[PDB]
Amino acid sequence: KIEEGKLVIWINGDKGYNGLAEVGKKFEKDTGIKVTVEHPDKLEEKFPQVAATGDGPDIIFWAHDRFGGYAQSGLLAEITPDKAFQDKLYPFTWDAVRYNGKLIAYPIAVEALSLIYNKDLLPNPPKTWEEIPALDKELKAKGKSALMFNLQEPYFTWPLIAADGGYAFKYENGKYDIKDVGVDNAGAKAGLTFLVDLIKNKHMNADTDYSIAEAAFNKGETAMTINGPWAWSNIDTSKVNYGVTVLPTFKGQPSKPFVGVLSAGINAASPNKELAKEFLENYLLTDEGLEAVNKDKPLGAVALKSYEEELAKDPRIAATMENAQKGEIMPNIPQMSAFWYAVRTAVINAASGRQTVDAALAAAQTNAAALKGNIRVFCRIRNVDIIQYEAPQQELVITRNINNNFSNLRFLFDKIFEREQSNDLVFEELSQLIQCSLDGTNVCVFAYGQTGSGKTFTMSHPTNGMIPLSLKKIFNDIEELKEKGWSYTVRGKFIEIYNEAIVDLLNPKIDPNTKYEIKHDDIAGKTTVTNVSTIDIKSPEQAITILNQANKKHSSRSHSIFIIDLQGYNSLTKESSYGTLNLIDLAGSERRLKETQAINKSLSCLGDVIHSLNLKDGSHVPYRNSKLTYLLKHSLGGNSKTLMFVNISPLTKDLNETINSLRFATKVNN
Ligand SMILES: OC[C@H]1O[C@H](O[C@H]2[C@H](O)[C@@H](O)[C@@H](O[C@H]3[C@H](O)[C@@H](O)[C@@H](O[C@H]4[C@H](O)[C@@H](O)[C@@H](O)O[C@@H]4CO)O[C@@H]3CO)O[C@@H]2CO)[C@H](O)[C@@H](O)[C@@H]1O
Ligand SMILES: Nc1ncnc2c1ncn2[C@@H]1O[C@H](COP(=O)(O)OP(=O)(O)O)[C@@H](O)[C@H]1O
Ligand SMILES: [Mg+2]
């Protein structure tokens, strides 16, 4: 638990935490209340984790964008400033920390990105992004470079991506429309394409991160960088004469940075809430409190009117607010984290050359929007006492006549297939996902349910199972894409997981000590299993034959995984792609004890993993916990797409296992 009678504070490592610690010392000196300031890594991810338990800091600092999520999860206390105190802060800063009509944090300062330039290398910085390549060539001839900035965090790249029309959520009326996302529109593609072109032309390096960019600029090696107010003090102590100015325009339009309000929230589980308020209102949010923090790392444009007025003629702060005015305040809705995770992955994938700009943003768009989503769950009622069900719009309602009362259990699916609806109709939901794989976005297709429910019929029917149809579709699409300069190779692996052991179902290695280790490349997001044999697929018919034979050999008590790797190269654009389609026929889920124990653990872990992924909020994803999830790690996370068929029997006698299956389903569908 949290210690009553103390304050523990968490703030990010890039802010002036030593200055903040000074404030805590004054608070301790006056009140006897000890204040401890900490800057743990990934604290914005740890907070929701520990605070869910009733642990964590009394006070948490972060930009306002994260706080809506915390509030929706009940992790924050409503703050209670009176009107005399509210009047001391700008109204627009109070707006940033209001969620569902309630104030959920104290606003501290307004932050936006600006262009920072070396006045000696570059007396007249470029007004446009478009000039940068030529400027870089000139500087390179003096052993310098034009621009270096953090490319790992979408916060830094977004202003360019937004310039020509990109946006997170359409703003119409009160509400941000979580169904209208602007991540893959023409504006966003244009911006990201420009960024990627800079990298292709060697004006920037895909690997550049915060530390690299900072050392480069502060050492006088690059002429420009892009950063926020917190970075100024390190430049002050450097030898560089720098200026802070408006970001470059793109296609004549201003870059639009996301505007953040550094905010301080109170842990709902703190037994120190009144003390936290005294500290925040009477010590931090004062001229002297803010100056202590500001002198450590600059805050930007502070929320406190008196001190803001005092610093207003600082040209760096003026530049900050000009860029701010041109950008947009960040939404604080829980969905923002989904947005950020999605865009982070897209940018990294495009910038590194692993995926085209279009394909990267397409996948991020889907992950970030409340539409079809990344994880799709379907119920398939096998064709056939038959249970009494209705499938209204989609909802499954099962009615039991429990001697002698009427029970109605309800379950919500993306779609429900039932009597005689063919494999060809079901495959229409998987069909468009094939193009995703060809574009390098990974895909998993699971069939789940009790033995007899129809998993293998769905996945492996020799004419129209999901496997044969997927192979058929892949080859059709590959042929069409030749017209656009693409050539692809198709490789398959067929493996089985039984009681946690991997068996190559194609080439069963003979050495008894032969190991099948799952080995990830967390850089490229690739995975191989040591010693599993791969076949080069020349036709669907060929692969289907091999798989038919490989089967000629228990299946109901193990996972069967068919892994198709798609590798493309385009001779016209010189681009590359690597995508994986995983087709999984799961072990039966029905309730030999070793088998049973292992299956339950595996299936339960699968559900744990999918559920967390669906929260898209950064909760822990325990891939290690099973060979299945560990194997499929890089086709489950990121902007990967998953399809889950929950197969069920229509027989009254199977009602209990059907209900178990259906309950698993609602867990993974969120
Ligand atoms: O697993 C991947 C990574 O996940 C973690 O980072 C996430 C955050 O959890 C998300 O909250 C989000 O971050 C946003 C952030 O919310 C937003 O306020 C802004 O961050 C600025 C910040 O306002 C500013 O004050 C200053 O500190 O710089 C920040 C940017 O670095 O923008 C963020 C997005 O870039 O998204 C990220 C993922 O992109 C985790 O921390 C990472 O370690 C992890 O790699
Ligand atoms: N939707 C369906 N329509 C008609 N027959 C089916 C359907 N699903 C399964 N079957 C039949 O039921 C039997 C058992 O199905 P199967 O796919 O083996 O279940 P599981 O793999 O889940 O144990 C198979 O012989 C199959 O032909
Ligand atoms: Mg089967």
Domains in the chain with CATH codes = 1-369 (no CATH), 371-670 (3.40.850.10)
Atom of ligand 2 minimally distant from the CA of 647: 22
d(CA 553, CA 555): 9
How far, in Å, is the centroid of ligand 1 from the Cα of 343? 11
Nearest to 589 by CA among 665, 643, 642: 665
Contact 196, 360 (CB under 8 A): no
- The DSSP 8-state label assigned to residue 298 in this structure reads -
How far, in Å, is the centroid of ligand 2 from the Cα of 599? 20
Contact 136, 146 (CB under 8 A): yes
CA dihedral 605, 580, 561, 595 (to 10 degrees): -20
Which resolution, in Å, applies to this structure? 2.2
Beta-strand pair 242-245/375-381? unpaired
**Which amino acid residue places its CA nearest to atom 16 of ligand 2?**
454
Burial bucket for residue 371 (CB in 10 Å: 0-12, 13-18, 19+): exposed
Nearest to 594 by CA among 495, 501, 455, 456: 501
**Which amino acid residue places its CA nearest to atom 36 of ligand 1?**
340
Return the ligand number nearest the Cα of 457.
Answer: 2
d(CA 175, CA 646): 35
The structure tokens listed for 132 are 């940068």
Reduce the DSSP state of residue 42 to 3 states and report it. Answer: coil
d(CA 460, CA 468): 7
**Which amino acid residue places its CA nearest to atom 32 of ligand 1?**
155
| Residues at Cβ < 5 Å from ligand 3 ion | 455-456
The structure tokens listed for 609 are 């993993």
Nearest to 555 by CA among 533, 585, 581, 583: 585
* Number of other residues whose CB lies within 10 A of the CB of residue 152: 18
The structure tokens listed for 105 are 């944090």
Atom of ligand 2 minimally distant from the CA of 459: 17
CA distances 429 to 23, 580, 655, Å, are 58, 17, 27
452 a known binding residue?
yes
388 a known binding residue?
no
- The DSSP 8-state label assigned to residue 618 in this structure reads -
Contact 174, 331 (CB under 8 A): no
d(CA 255, CA 166): 11
The structure tokens listed for 663 are 């309950």
How far, in Å, is the centroid of ligand 3 from the Cα of 491? 24
**Which amino acid residue places its CA nearest to atom 26 of ligand 2?**
457
256 a known binding residue?
no
List, in order, residues 6 or more apart from 107 with CB less than 8 Å away.
64, 89, 93, 94, 96, 97, 261, 262, 263, 303
Rg of the chain taking only CA atoms, in angstroms: 28
List, in order, residues 6 or more apart from 604 with CB less than 8 Å away.
none
Return the ligand number nearest the Cα of 211.
Answer: 1
How far, in Å, is the centroid of ligand 2 from the Cα of 407? 28
Which of 381, 453, 455, 457 most suits a substitution to test ligand 2, by most atoms within 8 Å of the C-beta?
457
Place of tokens 């972060």: 62
d(CA 234, CA 214): 9
The structure tokens listed for 450 are 């009790």
Peptide bond before 404: cis, by omega within 30 degrees of 0?
Answer: yes
Reduced 3-state DSSP string for 109-177: EEECCEEEEECCCCCCCCCEHHHHHHHHHHHHCCCCEEECCCCCCHHHHHHHHHHCCCEEEEECCCCEE
- The DSSP 8-state label assigned to residue 625 in this structure reads G
Way the structure was solved: X-ray
List, in order, residues 6 or more apart from 12 with CB less than 8 Å away.
39, 43, 44, 61, 62
List, in order, residues 6 or more apart from 454 with CB less than 8 Å away.
380, 382, 647
Reduce the DSSP state of residue 466 to 3 states and report it. Answer: helix
What is the CB < 6 Å shell around ligand 2? 382-383, 449, 451-457, 556, 647
List, in order, residues 6 or more apart from 205 with CB less than 8 Å away.
148, 151, 199
Beta-strand pair 106-111/167-171? unpaired
Return the ligand number nearest the Cα of 96.
Answer: 1
d(CA 77, CA 3): 17
How far, in Å, is the centroid of ligand 1 from the Cα of 572? 36
Place of tokens 């199977």: 654
How far, in Å, is the centroid of ligand 3 from the Cα of 393? 30
Q: Which residues of 376-388 are buried (b: 16+ CB within 10 A; e: fewer)?
A: bbbbbbbeeeebe
Contact 176, 262 (CB under 8 A): no
Query: To which H or E segment does residue 228 belong?
Result: none
Beta-strand pair 98-99/145-147? unpaired
* Number of other residues whose CB lies within 10 A of the CB of residue 202: 12
d(CA 439, CA 568): 8
Start-end of H helices in 271-314: 273-279, 287-296, 305-311
Nearest to 669 by CA among 385, 266, 396, 420: 396
